[PDB]
Amino acid sequence: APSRNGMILKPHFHKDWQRRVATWFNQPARKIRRRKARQARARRIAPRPAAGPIRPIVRCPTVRYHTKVRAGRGFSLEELRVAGIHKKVARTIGISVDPRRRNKS
Protein backbone atom coordinates (compact mmCIF):
# COMPACT_ATOMS: atom_id res chain seq x y z
CA ALA A 1 0.00 0.00 0.00
CA PRO A 2 1.47 3.33 -1.08
CA SER A 3 1.46 6.09 1.52
CA ARG A 4 1.69 9.78 0.62
CA ASN A 5 4.34 11.08 -1.78
CA GLY A 6 6.82 8.34 -2.60
CA MET A 7 8.38 6.68 -5.62
CA ILE A 8 6.71 3.42 -6.57
CA LEU A 9 9.30 0.68 -7.02
CA LYS A 10 9.60 -2.70 -8.74
CA PRO A 11 11.85 -5.02 -6.68
CA HIS A 12 12.82 -8.18 -8.57
CA PHE A 13 12.54 -10.38 -5.49
CA HIS A 14 9.54 -12.53 -6.41
CA LYS A 15 11.59 -15.60 -7.36
CA ASP A 16 13.46 -17.94 -4.98
CA TRP A 17 16.25 -15.42 -4.64
CA GLN A 18 17.58 -16.66 -1.29
CA ARG A 19 18.57 -19.98 -2.86
CA ARG A 20 21.01 -18.16 -5.18
CA VAL A 21 22.99 -15.58 -3.17
CA ALA A 22 26.64 -15.48 -4.25
CA THR A 23 28.68 -14.03 -1.39
CA TRP A 24 32.20 -12.64 -1.78
CA PHE A 25 33.87 -13.79 1.44
CA ASN A 26 36.57 -15.61 -0.55
CA GLN A 27 37.52 -12.44 -2.44
CA PRO A 28 40.86 -11.82 -0.62
CA ALA A 29 41.71 -15.51 -0.97
CA ARG A 30 40.97 -15.33 -4.70
CA LYS A 31 43.17 -12.24 -5.05
CA ILE A 32 46.02 -13.99 -3.22
CA ARG A 33 45.62 -17.08 -5.41
CA ARG A 34 45.60 -15.01 -8.60
CA ARG A 35 48.72 -13.11 -7.57
CA LYS A 36 50.51 -16.32 -6.60
CA ALA A 37 49.67 -17.95 -9.94
CA ARG A 38 50.83 -14.77 -11.69
CA GLN A 39 54.19 -14.94 -9.89
CA ALA A 40 54.50 -18.66 -10.63
CA ARG A 41 53.93 -18.13 -14.36
CA ALA A 42 56.30 -15.15 -14.44
CA ARG A 43 59.09 -17.14 -12.79
CA ARG A 44 58.39 -20.14 -15.03
CA ILE A 45 58.87 -18.11 -18.21
CA ALA A 46 62.28 -16.93 -17.07
CA PRO A 47 63.50 -14.08 -19.34
CA ARG A 48 60.37 -13.47 -21.42
CA PRO A 49 58.14 -10.44 -20.78
CA ALA A 50 55.88 -11.15 -17.82
CA ALA A 51 52.82 -9.75 -19.64
CA GLY A 52 53.02 -12.14 -22.60
CA PRO A 53 53.28 -11.15 -26.25
CA ILE A 54 53.15 -7.65 -27.68
CA ARG A 55 49.83 -6.43 -29.06
CA PRO A 56 48.94 -3.81 -31.69
CA ILE A 57 47.32 -0.37 -31.79
CA VAL A 58 43.53 -0.53 -32.09
CA ARG A 59 40.81 2.09 -32.49
CA CYS A 60 37.68 1.56 -30.43
CA PRO A 61 34.67 0.66 -32.61
CA THR A 62 31.74 2.91 -31.84
CA VAL A 63 31.34 6.68 -32.26
CA ARG A 64 31.33 7.05 -28.48
CA TYR A 65 34.88 5.68 -28.16
CA HIS A 66 36.34 6.04 -31.67
CA THR A 67 38.73 8.79 -30.49
CA LYS A 68 40.74 6.40 -28.29
CA VAL A 69 43.34 3.72 -28.98
CA ARG A 70 43.83 0.48 -27.05
CA ALA A 71 45.44 -2.95 -27.30
CA GLY A 72 43.80 -5.47 -29.61
CA ARG A 73 43.88 -9.22 -30.13
CA GLY A 74 46.87 -9.64 -32.45
CA PHE A 75 48.64 -8.19 -35.44
CA SER A 76 47.09 -8.68 -38.87
CA LEU A 77 48.55 -10.72 -41.70
CA GLU A 78 48.97 -7.65 -43.92
CA GLU A 79 50.98 -6.00 -41.14
CA LEU A 80 53.13 -9.12 -40.77
CA ARG A 81 53.84 -9.42 -44.49
CA VAL A 82 54.68 -5.72 -44.71
CA ALA A 83 56.97 -5.93 -41.66
CA GLY A 84 58.70 -9.00 -43.10
CA ILE A 85 57.96 -11.48 -40.29
CA HIS A 86 56.54 -14.93 -41.00
CA LYS A 87 53.10 -16.02 -39.81
CA LYS A 88 54.36 -19.11 -37.99
CA VAL A 89 57.57 -17.50 -36.65
CA ALA A 90 55.90 -14.45 -35.13
CA ARG A 91 54.18 -16.49 -32.43
CA THR A 92 57.41 -18.35 -31.63
CA ILE A 93 59.32 -15.09 -31.17
CA GLY A 94 56.49 -13.57 -29.15
CA ILE A 95 54.12 -11.57 -31.37
CA SER A 96 50.34 -11.89 -31.17
CA VAL A 97 48.74 -12.77 -34.52
CA ASP A 98 45.15 -13.01 -35.66
CA PRO A 99 43.94 -13.78 -39.20
CA ARG A 100 40.57 -12.12 -38.56
CA ARG A 101 41.69 -8.48 -38.57
CA ARG A 102 41.17 -6.40 -41.71
CA ASN A 103 43.03 -3.22 -42.66
CA LYS A 104 40.71 -0.56 -44.07
CA SER A 105 43.26 2.28 -44.10
Partner RNA sequence: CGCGACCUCAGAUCAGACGUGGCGACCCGCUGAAUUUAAGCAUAUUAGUCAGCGGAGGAAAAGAAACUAACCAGGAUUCCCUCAGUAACGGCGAGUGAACAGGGAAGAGCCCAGCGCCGAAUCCCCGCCCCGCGGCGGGGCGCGGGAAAUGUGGCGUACGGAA
Shortest reach from residue 62's CB to another protein, in Å = 16
Which of 26, 32, 36, 38 is close enough to bind RNA by CB under 7 A? 38
Question: Phi/psi at 65 (nearest 5 deg)?
Answer: -120, 5
CA 94, 101, 86 angle in degrees (round to 5)? 40
Per partner kind, with CB cut-offs from 5 to 8 A, the member of another protein, RNA, none near residue 2 is none
Q: What is the contact mask toward another protein in residues 13 to 52, using x (rule: CB under 8 A)?
A: --x-x--xxxxxx-x------------------xxxx---
Q: Which is nearer to RNA, 4 or 68 (CB)?
A: 68
Q: Is 74 exposed, middle or buried (0-12, 13-18, 19+ CB in 10 A)?
A: buried
